[PDB]
Amino acid sequence: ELDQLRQEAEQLKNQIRDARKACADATLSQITNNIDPVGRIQMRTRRTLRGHLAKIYAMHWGTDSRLLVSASQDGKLIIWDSYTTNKVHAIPLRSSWVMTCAYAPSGNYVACGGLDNICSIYNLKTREGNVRVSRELAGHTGYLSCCRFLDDNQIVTSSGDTTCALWDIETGQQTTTFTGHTGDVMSLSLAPDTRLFVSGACDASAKLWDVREGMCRQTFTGHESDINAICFFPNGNAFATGSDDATCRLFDLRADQELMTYSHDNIICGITSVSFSKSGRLLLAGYDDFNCNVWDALKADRAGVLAGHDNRVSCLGVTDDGMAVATGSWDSFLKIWN
Amino acid sequence: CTLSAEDKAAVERSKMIDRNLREDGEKAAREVKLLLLGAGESGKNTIVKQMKTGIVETHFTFKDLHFKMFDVGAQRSERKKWIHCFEGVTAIIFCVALSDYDLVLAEDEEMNRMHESMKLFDSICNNKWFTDTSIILFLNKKDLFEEKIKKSPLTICYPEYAGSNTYEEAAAYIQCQFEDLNKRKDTKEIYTHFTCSTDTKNVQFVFDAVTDVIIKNNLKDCGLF
């Protein structure tokens, strides 16, 4: 009976919550109470990157911690040099409606996608000296919210069709499709070891996935609205989520439950982008109120605020060496903070 | 200068890239962006046919004016996540079928098709991302509405309607009902045009509406407001 199946699902959900409540012997706040507070963190805008003529929707950092790519609705995907504010490349796009961009770890490729539901892979290093479309990945039935590179041949894409995918670039086919989200997936974050990745969707749920098998090991709940940004802790045993309910939450995979929430009464707007510092102590979240607040991971205290963007900060990124963090905003500007 | 030879050449490449970006941005600013919306088989395809995946982009030039029309009828996702990408469009072309009053929606008979069109219009007109964007309202299927209004009355869609079965009164009532959905009447203005399959002046109506929008925008820019 369908009612019997629903009752069984409810019983399994009660078992899950009972087990999680059993594992909650002591919260993060009590354990990290004695830690010396981080203190106020003031970060000046070292570089401002100008040249975008529309809202900046995406931004990613190369592995070298110097070259970054930026995506905007002007139809262009600019690779910047952070140290010297030079434009290494400017890539025209067939579709100007882009929402995400990626930088390959090898740095040879850059991926871009958006409302066309196509992940376009761009070959930066070519004999002809120009950036060219290498592969147009098709198959999704909704807007691409985020794409991240595993290596030169594998890429993970999250779409508005409630399905994440892992592509094999050489053949342009879907190696495995991830299903289980009721709402549209809005962000994904690969583990540093690259065998798992977290997907945050509009169902207020974040799900762990195994890239090789295709099953969802854990599903995380607690948010009251759409999760816009997700990010892995540097360890890979934890991740943070940014939602529209103006709260950021830190989950751990092994304990399978949330640890604590990053919320303030003054903050009403939803978190658009989230990021972590190299040590994981600082949680940088880009808010819709033209601000980017830096939090403390182990204590709910807010260390500092990075102001300087006229419009909504749409993307965030901390370098691999952790020295600089970039805030891209709808006001057509990029800023490097240190 | 304290710059190497290749450093200077890299800066020169950056300046050339900046020049190309400036020219492309000026070209884009010269262009007119229209967002095309409709509910079901409202005639959106027909009006696309007259003028000339997720987004179907159509470009055309009419009277030295370059037109971008974006169609998002195939997205089938949460509209609030991607509706802010279209903030800044010159005008929103809303397509509504007049014959939908008699027909009921495919999914369940509880909801009438025209009521779903009204709900979409209320969500789009009153959205916070489109507070200053004018709307071009295309009411299609005039021949179908003429044929239907004789056989079936407008009271089925509108029980409060107490008027003649003639085309003019019913069309005026439908247009007035759609125009009342504009809460911010001061910020925007809605242009309504009655079109059919054989109509050939829809492009002219769109051109006039965009001309008015450009006039108002540059009045605001010039300080006259």
């Epitope: 000296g129 120009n130 | 290749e6 050449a9 890299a10 020169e12």
Partner: single-chain antibody, 232 residues
Amino acid sequence: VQLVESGGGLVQPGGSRKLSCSASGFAFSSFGMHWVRQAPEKGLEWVAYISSGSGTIYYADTVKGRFTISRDDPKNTLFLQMTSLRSEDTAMYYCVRSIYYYGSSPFDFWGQGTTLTVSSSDIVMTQATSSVPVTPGESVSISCRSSKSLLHSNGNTYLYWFLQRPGQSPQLLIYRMSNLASGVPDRFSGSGSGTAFTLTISRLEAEDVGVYYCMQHLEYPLTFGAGTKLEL
């Protein structure tokens, strides 16, 4: 990618000729372009350089005034107009492409060469040996020296290595003293202390015979080395 060069021919002293380099297979507008001269029995010497968009143009002191370099982007060709020729210019002329961004590989591709026959504070690079016997399968180190330090404040040391096989145009081996060029076998490697630099080949095949030149890019009067010849 190809750079076919036309021109040359017998020229009387004091005459004038035009050299045309035709580009096919790459974005000509993006690449900065150079002209390099190789004497019939001597090494390479820089002549002129034109940047992307013709923004900046630099000549050597020898050909300053007499020579002018211009490019035609729409027709994908590069022009070198020579006037007041002398017996100092009788040589083979090379048309070399160079692109300049972060991580780029300048002097990547070289043209075949066209022969011009005339009838009858700059950094100094020294490669002392100029000829060394070698055995296949062994390891060889080639040394070059610079009058001034090639290390800039940005941390980039601008030294370039080129291989000129017998009857073949120069091919880039190492750019900026450590980075292997695209397609060059991994056996080659480079190292240096900022004033003196070495190029090391772990193993030698029959393809490695040729003359190796050390070039500098710190200041635009680019001076090539005399060259070291490896013969078995």
